[model samples]
Target chain A: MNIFEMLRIDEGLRLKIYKDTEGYYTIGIGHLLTKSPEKLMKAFESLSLFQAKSELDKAIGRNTNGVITKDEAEKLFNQDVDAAVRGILRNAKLKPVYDSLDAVRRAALINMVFQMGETGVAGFTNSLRMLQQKRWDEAAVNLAKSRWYNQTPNRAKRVITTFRTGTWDAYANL
Target chain B: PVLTQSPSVSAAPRQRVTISVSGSNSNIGSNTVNWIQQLPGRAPELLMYDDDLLAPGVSDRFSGSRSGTSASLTISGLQSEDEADYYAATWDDSLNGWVFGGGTKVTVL
Candidate 1:
């Protein structure tokens, strides 16, 4: 069966897949990655207008099976979803342009959220703007300004190094 | 999904060892990998995945590598504190409960 057909997603689903750095959405992502149902599929369909946090919460929890509690979802989030957009920004805060954001930035940004949480993501509007300009220099400068950068100096430095390099090479080892 | 852990264990300080996760070989195949760790009384950390792609905040010493249907979690400079039980998780077809490789006991060699 056609992969798309097998998925039973909307015919327009193909359009919903985010545009990734490799000229495409990184071809395929995740191990045992499969089509998501409910809000996740919904989130991607209207990514430009969707709130990723809620949808992500819904997504990483249960698909056709059911829904997991907020706590349960939090614990199992990484295990289930190939990626969690909410980690980067709250659902209401995520933007359509973000739907097509660079893959590493998208992932790293989420890692920031998963580490820092909602309030931290909300405060990153300035950084997000820098990212939008593709201002690697200023963005690295701004990324360095965060408390995380101040506390865990090495991690911030490494992330900035990767961002400045424009190469996912350092990330390949993980 | 079910998860499994390796039987490798060692008491030697700074020794490294690799654990295995046996699953499929396609989109949900050996191409991408995810490793999770839960200390005796703590939350699980998303250790590794995406064909050795490490999520941020993870240490370089915690490596993810692959070959066929089997992927690995190779811990370098291992420590006695690293004895915590490990579990490998993957997105099931439904994207539900991470199908894990049974579970591995990391004992002192």
Candidate 2:
């Protein structure tokens, strides 16, 4: 399966706004609107990091406005995917490794970046090195030791399996 | 209303390259132009802003310039680590959102 299809299933489509697991306002396939540029301009541009967090905390308490149409959601989803791919491509340590992988394996890495920002995915140094070395099993095992795996066991299992096997079966049937 | 950039640019190590971005239905000079670098598996980070101002920690080898509807980021003394996608971004008043160039992949030989 492709990265978009995989993320559609994993992130789940939401036409309405809701707070994510981290209590940030999210919409339309995991778009974290609270951190979006528009939202930041509205509330946090001049604020300190701590102040931004405080503002976000207050902001999430309010009910967000507007429901996105399916088409609009798809548009946002496409943009988010583009950003995720860019993020993956921009990573120095992971770029070479990403270029060396098969399509399915590349989708797995992109999926991880889609869920967590590129920096978060980059935190798996050992896993990335293992993947780079083509030590698939070790990469999977190393990734499994993380909080990401612990928090989203099902999603992580599918992605880790895809990385290890270099196949789409893990996500294709789902 | 989009920004256009070269799809790919190739240069040998220690060589120089300039990536350019042009605007359509948008004035490149109305807003500040920012250049961003994206390494694989990482988020895009700011490299240069305000047409030519280097962001903190950015090397002197990189610079930005704008002319009419176009802007460019020039990198000298290119190294292998410099091989990445570069994008130009600017705020679009009509769109009320940030517009980004499609991105140019800088390949170092």
Candidate 3:
């Protein structure tokens, strides 16, 4: 799948800092930043307190680790998520199945894997099998049978919608 | 779609306190607001829902309303116990769910 397409499928445009559900520092499209503010500032010159003001978090107090620019965050997100996508494809041996599907369906898998991580996506064995067998509709059904769907119902629904329709836009946003 | 709040504010006990919740139309003005109140070192509690609707057992001092794409949570007859953190939440049609503000730390001066 095109790296750009895969990137867009998962993350929306967030030019400021935010927190994930687990309270970790996040920026751009679901990019996780380590808690080391010193390291974060050293890593990106664009990251500063004024820049962090875009979305300041009391949960983080006055830490700059929660800060990052759109360009920097997107750069890091692409690097990290792309590697996860490739790693999952290689480990799950789903590269062939991935190639068999259309770009949109392939994006659905990549995006899901990005959110869940390589191991998490690989654990969806039945769903993976259905995708490999070209059972598009059943594959979507299998996707629903998971803890992730229950935790993030709307997100899962959007991804499954794309999986069923084979349209990337069906679940690209959010 | 995201919600944000001002850094910090302070008020005297028994005075009125207000916090603003900012967001875009997709996550604020176009949707109802929910508010959360948290004491230091304590988990947050739902204070208001659907703009003005109060959560069960919550004090009547709390109320919420939207103005344009921004919302505010006001505490009438604020007390020392009210010196805590407040955050806002709203639904996002595009994101297909709810999003939260960064939270404001209120100091009872």
Candidate 4:
């Protein structure tokens, strides 16, 4: 499966701005609008976070109550995904491991980077080392010990399983 | 917001070097300054935060300090592993986001 499909399942598409669990104003598959460009923020300056989530639930389109269209959301999503991939590829420590992995396993790593910034994923030092050593089972076990596993058990399950099996079957139909 | 850092510095092993980051606005020191290290082709790693608090596993030889709109990272007793690009970052209230300085490359000769 492609990374987009996997991410769509994990980070649901939301064209309208809404507050994430952590209370950040997010839109278009988890883009933090608070950190967005000036133009985007200015467009929604009149709306509060609660109002955006409540009153603008049906809003869709750049000019519609400052909400964005699917195309804009998709573009943002692509940039985020690219950043995640680049974070992994540019890391000297993770680059070799990323290069050695199969497509499915690579996607799993990218997903982790997407959810948890590069530094957060890098905190999995032991698991990364294990993966580099080709010790799949150990790496998965180590990853399970992280707070990410505790917080997002289902998503972590799929990623760990993919790491262990090096196949897309774990995310099949997801 | 703009942050400027030295382009590069070279020092012999065991020598000390300081990399400075200057901001265009005074907001640079309004929030905690963070330093990151990126080895060639490697993922960037947090070196220090709040100007001087070293990250776990970081050597005490590395220290940070800030004054006015400028911050500095000082590495004492530089080693081969210390050769890398360093960046200073902090929050920009105007942009409502974090801003990073142009990286400074440290060469251990």
A1-174, model 3: which lDDT tens digit per residue? 344545555466556566455545456666555332322222121122222332333323343334555556556666766676577568846676677788777777777777777678777878888887878899888788888999988779878888888875554453
Residue range A74-129, candidate 4, lDDT tens digits: 77778787777777888886788888887888889888888887788888888988
**Superposition error at B85 for model 2 (Å):** 36
Candidate 1 lDDT tens digits, A50-117:
12222332445443122234344333434423345543333556554255467665655554554465
Cα RMSDs, all models: 19.4, 15.0, 14.6, 15.4
Question: Model 3, B42-63: lDDT tens per residue?
Answer: 6466677777877778898888
The candidate 2 chain B region of ten consecutive residues with least summed lDDT is B24-33
Candidate 2 RMSD to the correct structure: 15.0
Alpha-carbon shift of residue B19 in model 3 (angstroms): 43
By summed lDDT, the worst window of 10 consecutive residues in model 3 chain A runs over: A41-50
Q: What's the TM-score of chain B for every model shown?
A: 0.76, 0.93, 0.92, 0.95
Quote the lDDT for B99 in model 4. 65
- Kept native contacts, as fractions per model, are 0.00, 0.00, 0.00, 0.00
Residue A143 error for model 4, in Å?
1.7
Using TM-score as the measure, which candidate wins?
A: 4
Better model by lDDT, 1 or 4? 4
Alpha-carbon TM-score of each model against the true structure: 0.36, 0.48, 0.44, 0.50
Weakest 10 consecutive residues, lDDT, candidate 4 chain A? A35-44
Runs of candidate 2 exceeding 4 Å displacement: A19-23, A35-65, B1-109
Off by more than 4 A, model 3: A1-13, A19-23, A36-72, A172-174, B1-109
| Cα lDDT tens digits for candidate 1, B3-102 | 4456546556688787887776432463345666655654445566564766557778888777666778888887766776666655555443235555
Q: For residue B80, what is the lDDT in candidate 2? A: 92
- The list of candidate 1 runs beyond 4 A from truth reads A1-174, B1-3, B26-31, B94-97
